[PDB]
Amino acid sequence: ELPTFKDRVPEYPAWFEPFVIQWLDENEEVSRDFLHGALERDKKDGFQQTSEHALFSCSVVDVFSQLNQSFEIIKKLECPDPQIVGHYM
Amino acid sequence: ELPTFKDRVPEYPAWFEPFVIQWLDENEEVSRDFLHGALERDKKDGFQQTSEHALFSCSVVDVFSQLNQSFEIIKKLECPDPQIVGHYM
Amino acid sequence: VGEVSVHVELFTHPGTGEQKVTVKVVAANDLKWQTSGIFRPFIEVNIVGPQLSDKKRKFATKSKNNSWAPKYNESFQFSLSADAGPECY
């Protein structure tokens, strides 16, 4: 709210961005290990449909759940630099 | 790219060569005076190794930086006369 | 008091017909600053010209410890206005 910085896109997100990318990295690898676990749990479940009308099996759901938990951790930063956001994206 | 001059080694570098030579000279003096500076810093610092893996002291880095700056200018001329280039070299 | 190697690419931005100015800060050299302490040079780059109130006018390289010839290799990207030509900047 000081005029000097109301005048500007905040530069501070450039500081954290590598740590967010690191987090995105830790996150992806965890997510890929999770993906294999989920596929394999579903495979062990013989790939049953999630119900007789939910025609896909549960790993799909688990994965989207994970991906959303993950995405929301990003989204919760609301980085005011949209190019740094673009980089996360 | 005009046929008339793709048919030649360009003559314009011969215009500038005396100036590039004068520049190489000036650059040598600047390099030798820079060197004594770089060494005097390093000597006064008691020749600290630059780091625990850069087993050499800073004056090396200074000097090669100066040389590399100097070289890169010449190299960016890309003088199309190999004899003028040989002379520069 | 020294010199700065830059490589600069004006892009009459191939994506917009605005002008963007990429500035690769390669290095500095011959910095007349053999200081009474730890020298820690960094290079601020600023764009100057009309209609820049809404724009990031300033960048800086990282700093380099004890280095009168610090390399950077850091590439910045100013936006100019769309209206004012590059000769206004």
Coordinates of C-alpha atoms in Angstrom, one line a residue:
Chain A
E1 CA 0.0 0.0 0.0
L2 CA 3.0 2.4 0.1
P3 CA 2.7 4.1 -3.3
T4 CA 6.2 3.0 -4.3
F5 CA 5.2 -0.7 -4.2
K6 CA 1.5 -0.3 -5.0
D7 CA 3.1 0.9 -8.3
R8 CA 4.5 -2.7 -8.9
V9 CA 4.0 -6.4 -9.4
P10 CA 5.7 -7.7 -6.3
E11 CA 9.2 -9.1 -7.0
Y12 CA 9.4 -11.4 -4.0
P13 CA 7.9 -14.4 -5.8
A14 CA 11.0 -14.7 -7.9
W15 CA 12.8 -15.5 -4.7
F16 CA 10.6 -18.5 -3.7
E17 CA 10.1 -19.8 -7.3
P18 CA 13.1 -22.3 -7.3
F19 CA 11.8 -23.7 -4.0
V20 CA 8.4 -24.1 -5.4
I21 CA 9.9 -25.8 -8.5
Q22 CA 11.9 -28.0 -6.1
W23 CA 8.6 -28.7 -4.3
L24 CA 7.0 -29.4 -7.8
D25 CA 9.8 -31.9 -8.4
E26 CA 9.5 -33.7 -5.1
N27 CA 5.8 -33.6 -5.7
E28 CA 6.0 -35.1 -9.2
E29 CA 8.4 -37.9 -8.2
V30 CA 6.2 -38.7 -5.2
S31 CA 3.2 -38.5 -7.6
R32 CA 4.9 -41.0 -10.0
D33 CA 5.7 -43.4 -7.2
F34 CA 2.2 -43.0 -6.0
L35 CA 0.9 -43.5 -9.6
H36 CA 2.7 -46.9 -9.8
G37 CA 1.4 -47.8 -6.3
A38 CA -2.2 -46.8 -7.2
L39 CA -2.1 -48.7 -10.6
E40 CA -0.6 -51.7 -8.8
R41 CA -3.3 -51.7 -6.0
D42 CA -5.9 -51.4 -8.6
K43 CA -4.2 -54.3 -10.6
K44 CA -4.2 -56.3 -7.4
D45 CA -7.9 -55.5 -7.3
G46 CA -8.0 -57.0 -10.9
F47 CA -9.0 -53.5 -12.1
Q48 CA -12.7 -53.6 -10.9
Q49 CA -14.9 -50.8 -12.0
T50 CA -15.3 -48.2 -9.2
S51 CA -18.9 -49.2 -9.5
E52 CA -21.0 -51.0 -12.2
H53 CA -21.9 -47.5 -13.4
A54 CA -18.6 -45.7 -12.5
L55 CA -17.0 -47.6 -15.4
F56 CA -13.3 -46.8 -14.7
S57 CA -11.3 -48.3 -11.8
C58 CA -10.2 -46.5 -8.6
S59 CA -6.6 -45.6 -9.6
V60 CA -8.0 -42.9 -12.0
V61 CA -9.7 -41.3 -9.0
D62 CA -6.7 -41.6 -6.7
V63 CA -4.5 -40.0 -9.3
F64 CA -6.8 -37.1 -10.0
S65 CA -7.2 -36.7 -6.2
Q66 CA -3.4 -36.6 -5.8
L67 CA -3.0 -34.3 -8.8
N68 CA -5.6 -32.0 -7.3
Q69 CA -4.0 -32.1 -3.8
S70 CA -0.8 -31.2 -5.5
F71 CA -2.3 -28.5 -7.8
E72 CA -3.9 -26.8 -4.8
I73 CA -0.6 -26.6 -2.9
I74 CA 0.6 -24.6 -5.9
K75 CA -2.6 -22.6 -6.3
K76 CA -2.5 -21.7 -2.5
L77 CA 0.6 -19.5 -3.3
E78 CA -1.4 -17.2 -5.7
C79 CA 1.9 -15.8 -7.1
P80 CA 1.3 -12.2 -8.2
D81 CA 4.0 -12.7 -11.0
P82 CA 2.0 -14.5 -13.7
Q83 CA 5.1 -15.5 -15.6
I84 CA 6.5 -17.2 -12.5
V85 CA 3.0 -18.8 -12.3
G86 CA 3.3 -19.7 -16.0
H87 CA 6.6 -21.4 -15.1
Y88 CA 5.0 -23.5 -12.3
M89 CA 2.2 -24.3 -14.8
Chain B
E1 CA 25.7 -12.4 -50.7
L2 CA 25.8 -10.3 -53.9
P3 CA 27.6 -12.5 -56.5
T4 CA 30.0 -9.6 -57.2
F5 CA 31.4 -9.9 -53.6
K6 CA 30.7 -13.5 -52.7
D7 CA 33.3 -13.8 -55.5
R8 CA 35.9 -12.1 -53.1
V9 CA 37.6 -12.2 -49.7
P10 CA 36.1 -8.8 -48.4
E11 CA 38.4 -5.9 -48.6
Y12 CA 36.9 -3.8 -45.8
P13 CA 38.8 -5.6 -43.0
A14 CA 42.0 -4.3 -44.5
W15 CA 40.7 -0.8 -43.8
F16 CA 40.2 -1.6 -40.1
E17 CA 43.2 -3.8 -39.5
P18 CA 45.5 -0.9 -38.4
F19 CA 42.9 0.1 -35.8
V20 CA 42.4 -3.5 -34.6
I21 CA 46.2 -3.8 -34.2
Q22 CA 46.3 -0.5 -32.3
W23 CA 43.5 -1.9 -30.2
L24 CA 45.4 -5.2 -29.6
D25 CA 48.3 -3.2 -28.4
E26 CA 46.2 -1.1 -26.0
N27 CA 44.7 -4.2 -24.8
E28 CA 48.1 -5.8 -24.1
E29 CA 49.0 -2.8 -21.9
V30 CA 45.7 -2.8 -20.2
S31 CA 46.2 -6.6 -19.7
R32 CA 49.7 -6.2 -18.2
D33 CA 48.6 -3.4 -15.9
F34 CA 45.4 -5.3 -14.9
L35 CA 47.7 -8.3 -14.1
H36 CA 49.8 -6.4 -11.6
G37 CA 46.6 -5.2 -9.9
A38 CA 45.2 -8.7 -9.9
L39 CA 48.4 -10.1 -8.5
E40 CA 48.8 -7.4 -5.9
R41 CA 45.3 -8.1 -4.6
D42 CA 46.0 -11.8 -4.5
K43 CA 49.5 -11.4 -2.9
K44 CA 48.1 -9.0 -0.3
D45 CA 45.4 -11.7 0.4
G46 CA 48.3 -14.1 0.9
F47 CA 47.2 -16.2 -2.2
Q48 CA 44.1 -17.8 -0.7
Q49 CA 42.9 -20.7 -2.8
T50 CA 39.7 -19.5 -4.5
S51 CA 37.9 -22.4 -2.9
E52 CA 38.5 -25.9 -1.4
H53 CA 38.3 -27.3 -5.0
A54 CA 39.4 -24.2 -7.0
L55 CA 42.9 -25.0 -5.8
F56 CA 44.3 -21.8 -7.5
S57 CA 44.1 -18.2 -6.2
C58 CA 41.9 -15.4 -7.7
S59 CA 44.5 -13.6 -9.9
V60 CA 44.5 -16.5 -12.3
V61 CA 40.7 -16.1 -12.7
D62 CA 41.1 -12.3 -13.1
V63 CA 43.8 -12.6 -15.7
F64 CA 42.1 -15.3 -17.8
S65 CA 38.9 -13.3 -17.6
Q66 CA 40.8 -10.2 -18.9
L67 CA 42.4 -12.4 -21.6
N68 CA 39.1 -14.0 -22.5
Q69 CA 37.3 -10.6 -22.7
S70 CA 40.1 -9.5 -25.0
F71 CA 40.0 -12.6 -27.1
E72 CA 36.2 -12.6 -27.5
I73 CA 36.2 -9.1 -29.0
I74 CA 38.7 -10.3 -31.7
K75 CA 36.7 -13.4 -32.2
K76 CA 33.5 -11.5 -32.7
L77 CA 35.1 -9.5 -35.5
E78 CA 35.1 -12.9 -37.5
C79 CA 37.5 -11.2 -39.9
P80 CA 36.9 -12.9 -43.3
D81 CA 40.6 -12.3 -44.3
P82 CA 42.6 -15.3 -42.8
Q83 CA 45.9 -13.4 -43.2
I84 CA 44.6 -10.4 -41.3
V85 CA 43.2 -13.0 -38.8
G86 CA 46.7 -14.8 -38.7
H87 CA 48.2 -11.3 -38.0
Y88 CA 45.7 -10.6 -35.2
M89 CA 46.3 -14.1 -33.8
Chain C
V1 CA 35.6 2.8 -14.5
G2 CA 35.4 -0.6 -16.1
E3 CA 33.2 -2.1 -18.8
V4 CA 30.3 -4.5 -19.2
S5 CA 29.8 -7.1 -21.8
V6 CA 26.2 -7.3 -22.8
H7 CA 24.5 -9.1 -25.5
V8 CA 21.2 -7.4 -26.3
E9 CA 18.3 -8.6 -28.5
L10 CA 15.7 -6.2 -29.4
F11 CA 12.6 -8.3 -30.2
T12 CA 9.9 -6.4 -31.9
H13 CA 8.3 -9.1 -30.1
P14 CA 7.5 -11.8 -32.6
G15 CA 4.5 -12.8 -30.5
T16 CA 2.9 -9.2 -30.3
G17 CA 4.6 -6.3 -32.3
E18 CA 5.3 -4.6 -28.9
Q19 CA 9.0 -4.2 -28.2
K20 CA 10.7 -6.3 -25.7
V21 CA 14.4 -6.0 -24.9
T22 CA 16.3 -9.1 -23.9
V23 CA 19.6 -8.1 -22.1
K24 CA 22.1 -10.9 -21.6
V25 CA 24.5 -9.5 -19.0
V26 CA 27.6 -11.6 -19.8
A27 CA 30.3 -10.1 -17.6
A28 CA 32.0 -6.9 -16.3
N29 CA 35.7 -6.2 -16.5
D30 CA 38.3 -3.6 -15.3
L31 CA 36.1 -2.4 -12.5
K32 CA 38.0 0.5 -10.9
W33 CA 36.9 -0.6 -7.4
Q34 CA 39.8 -2.3 -5.5
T35 CA 37.9 -1.6 -2.3
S36 CA 38.6 -1.3 1.5
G37 CA 36.6 -4.6 2.0
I38 CA 34.9 -7.5 0.3
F39 CA 34.0 -6.3 -3.1
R40 CA 30.6 -8.0 -4.1
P41 CA 29.8 -6.5 -7.5
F42 CA 26.4 -7.0 -9.1
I43 CA 25.0 -5.3 -12.2
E44 CA 21.8 -3.4 -12.1
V45 CA 20.3 -2.9 -15.6
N46 CA 17.6 -0.2 -16.0
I47 CA 15.5 0.7 -19.1
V48 CA 14.9 4.4 -19.7
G49 CA 12.3 6.1 -21.9
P50 CA 8.6 7.1 -22.0
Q51 CA 5.6 5.1 -20.6
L52 CA 7.4 2.9 -18.1
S53 CA 5.2 3.5 -14.9
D54 CA 3.4 0.2 -15.4
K55 CA 6.6 -1.7 -16.2
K56 CA 9.6 -3.3 -14.4
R57 CA 12.2 -0.6 -15.0
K58 CA 15.0 -2.3 -13.1
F59 CA 16.8 -5.7 -13.0
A60 CA 20.0 -6.8 -11.3
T61 CA 22.5 -9.7 -11.7
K62 CA 23.4 -11.8 -8.7
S63 CA 26.5 -10.5 -6.9
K64 CA 30.0 -12.0 -7.2
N65 CA 32.5 -12.0 -4.4
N66 CA 35.9 -10.4 -4.7
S67 CA 35.8 -10.2 -8.5
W68 CA 36.8 -7.1 -10.6
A69 CA 36.0 -9.1 -13.7
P70 CA 32.7 -10.9 -12.6
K71 CA 30.9 -13.1 -15.1
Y72 CA 27.1 -13.2 -14.9
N73 CA 25.6 -14.7 -18.0
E74 CA 22.1 -13.4 -16.7
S75 CA 19.4 -12.6 -19.3
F76 CA 16.7 -9.9 -18.5
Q77 CA 13.7 -8.9 -20.6
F78 CA 12.4 -5.4 -20.4
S79 CA 9.2 -4.4 -22.0
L80 CA 9.1 -1.1 -23.9
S81 CA 5.9 0.6 -24.6
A82 CA 4.0 -0.5 -27.7
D83 CA 3.7 3.2 -28.9
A84 CA 7.1 4.8 -28.5
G85 CA 9.8 3.4 -30.9
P86 CA 13.1 1.9 -29.7
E87 CA 14.8 5.3 -30.4
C88 CA 12.7 6.8 -27.5
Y89 CA 14.6 4.4 -25.2

